[PDB]
């Protein structure tokens, strides 16, 4: 019956915050506004966004990749808007066949896929540069860029590094809703029950642990919002009763606890681990191990 602090009971709003200047060019910032629907669980302000060069490059090339996939879908639909909606999740932009290897393929036979992939790679690199530079101009510690680098590592292993090591673009997943799920299932089938890939198991452990740790941390912070526990930085420099009560709860529960700052180190490493181990697991599949169940039988965690 008590207030659980999941939604605000009352909203207040004044002029929107336009952000600290620091070393940021304020000319690249857009105007801001308010959205009261978003103020129940979080902030109602759709604040200013930085435009810059990296953002422009990323937006242009990501839109190019999206529109390339879209026009390929329209071609597969034969210009029919009704076929486009009927088979939207069934359309697929496939990589070139294994015959062409890593060379540039004809448009109808994977060239469009290669063009879209190049646009996507340019967009992703530009967005990583944007993350790093937005951290730098405000004087922050670049942790977001390194965290993004792990996801980029998995993404590039799936589409670039493993196809290069296997000698053909054909092993890369296609651009499609249902088609890439089929690609995932077929990858598991072809490499002998990817369940038995040890790095796959590590990645699953890290994903489950990320969910578990975010549940723990969110519940802990909401439990100590009575004492202003969500003001984490001030608690880091000026420890209050919220941090002490959270630490004592977890110490009395499981015998050890964290600090207001080190819990976020736990969080960032747990979240990084899933993609970090997943990239390694995918890179090992086909290049080093082609049947993970037989490999597990050899190495003593599958029955013979």
């Amino acid at each position: 019956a008590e207030y659980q602090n999941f939604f605000n009971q009352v909203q207040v709003a004044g002029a929107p915050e336009m952000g600290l200047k620091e070393d940021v060019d304020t000319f690249e910032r857009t105007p801001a506004g308010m959205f009261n629907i978003l103020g129940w669980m979080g902030n109602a302000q759709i604040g200013p966004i930085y435009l810059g060069i990296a953002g422009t490059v990323s937006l242009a090339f990501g839109a190019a990749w999206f529109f390339t996939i879209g026009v390929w879908y329209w071609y597969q639909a034969g210009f029919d808007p009704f076929i486009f909606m009927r088979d939207l999740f069934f359309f697929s932009l496939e990589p070139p066949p294994a015959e062409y290897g890593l060379a540039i393929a004809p448009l109808k036979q994977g060239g469009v896929w290669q063009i879209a992939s190049l646009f996507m790679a340019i967009s992703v690199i530009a967005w990583w540069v944007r993350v790093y530079t937005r951290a730098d101009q405000l004087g922050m510690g670049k942790h977001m860029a390194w965290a993004f680098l792990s996801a980029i590592w998995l993404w590039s292993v799936l589409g670039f590094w493993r196809p290069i090591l296997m000698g053909s673009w054909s092993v890369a997943p296609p651009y499609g809703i249902f088609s890439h799920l089929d690609w995932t299932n077929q990858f598991s089938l072809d490499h002998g029950n990817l369940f038995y890939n040890p790095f796959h198991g590590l990645s699953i452990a890290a994903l489950y642990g990320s969910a578990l740790l975010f549940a723990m941390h969110g519940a802990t912070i909401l439990a100590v919002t009575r004492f202003g526990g969500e003001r984490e930085l001030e608690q880091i420099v000026d420890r209050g009763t919220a941090s002490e009560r959270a630490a004592l709860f977890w110490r009395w529960t499981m015998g050890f606890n964290a600090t207001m700052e080190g819990i976020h180190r736990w969080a960032i490493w747990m979240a990084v681990m899933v993609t970090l181990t997943g990239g390694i697991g995918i890179l090992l599949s086909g290049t080093v191990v082609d049947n993970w169940y037989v490999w597990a039988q050899v190495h003593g965690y599958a029955p013979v």
Binding site: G42, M140, F178, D182, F195, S210, G218, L222, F249, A267
Partner: protein, 281 residues
């Protein structure tokens, strides 16, 4: 031993059962009545898993597996050497999890905080009970639950998923996968943002929450807020687990065919089913 600030919080009260009978600490661990029950159930389950390893004849920790009774046994209490040991271990695990949640409730009452942590743990307990009790009983036998082994339960997951073709096509399953991915992404972002505010560029003073809001507004045009991000992470994790539980609840009880075939009502709507062209002709 005690933390440098721990003494003023170790006060009596807050227990649910027994009053001050078990209101003490053992090292860092608060005990309580539910802590006593937790230690009993956990030790019994661990020793019974070891005994099942002895019966199996293997001491490799990655090969030990305790299997539930066969499907033909129904809901009967099975013999200990014919699946009954699995049932005893399941009872021990359920008791240990519930006792852990109630002990967390007691610790919350002693410290004067909310019960978000035990509620969130009860969500995972519900998922576990869905996989071992609710679904097997709705399917009519204990034999449909997963075994207690590090890789044999992965085999169970594989076989259960392939019972319905490619399990990716389950819609609640897609929702749960998306929620888990979003939870991992949000955890990475939150940890990175807090650490970057706390550990700025060398020579700079510590950043404020205003810096975090400015950073995420610059990057993507929106900031949810510290309270908002904590609420969002908790809700994302809880919804992911709940919708995974629903996806397993609907599979094999009200749906028995391929989910990829389920997805074809949209295609087979008569007003465009016969229209030539595209993927589905």
């Amino acid at each position: 031993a005690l933390l440098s600030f721990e003494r003023k919080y170790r006060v009596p009260g807050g227990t649910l059962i027994g009053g001050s009978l078990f209101d003490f600490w053992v090292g860092p661990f608060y005990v309580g009545f539910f802590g006593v029950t937790t230690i009993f159930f956990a030790t019994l389950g661990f020793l019974l898993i070891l005994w099942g390893a002895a019966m199996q004849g293997t001491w490799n920790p990655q090969l030990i597996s305790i299997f539930p009774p066969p499907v033909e046994n129904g809901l009967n209490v099975a013999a200990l050497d014919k699946g009954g040991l699995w049932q005893v271990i399941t009872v021990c695990a359920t008791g240990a999890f519930c006792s852990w949640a109630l002990r967390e409730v007691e610790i919350c009452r002693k410290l004067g905080i909310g019960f978000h942590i035990p509620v969130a743990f009860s969500m995972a307990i519900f998922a576990y009970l869905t996989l071992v009790v609710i679904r097997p009983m709705m399917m009519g036998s204990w034999g449909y639950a997963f075994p207690y082994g590090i890789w044999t339960h992965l085999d169970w997951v594989s076989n259960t998923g392939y019972t319905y073709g490619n399990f990716h096509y389950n819609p609640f399953h897609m929702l749960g996968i998306s929620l888990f991915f979003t939870t991992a992404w949000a955890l990475a972002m939150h940890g990175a943002l807090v650490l970057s505010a706390a550990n700025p560029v060398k020579g700079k003073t510590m950043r404020t929450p205003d810096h975090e809001d400015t950073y995420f507004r610059d990057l993507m045009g929106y900031s949810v807020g510290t309270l908002g991000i904590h609420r969002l992470g908790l809700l994302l994790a809880l919804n992911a687990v709940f919708w995974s539980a629903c996806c397993m609840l609907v599979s094999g009880t009200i749906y028995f065919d391929l989910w990829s075939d389920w997805w074809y009502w949209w295609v087979n709507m008569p007003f465009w089913a016969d229209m030539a062209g595209g993927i589905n002709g």
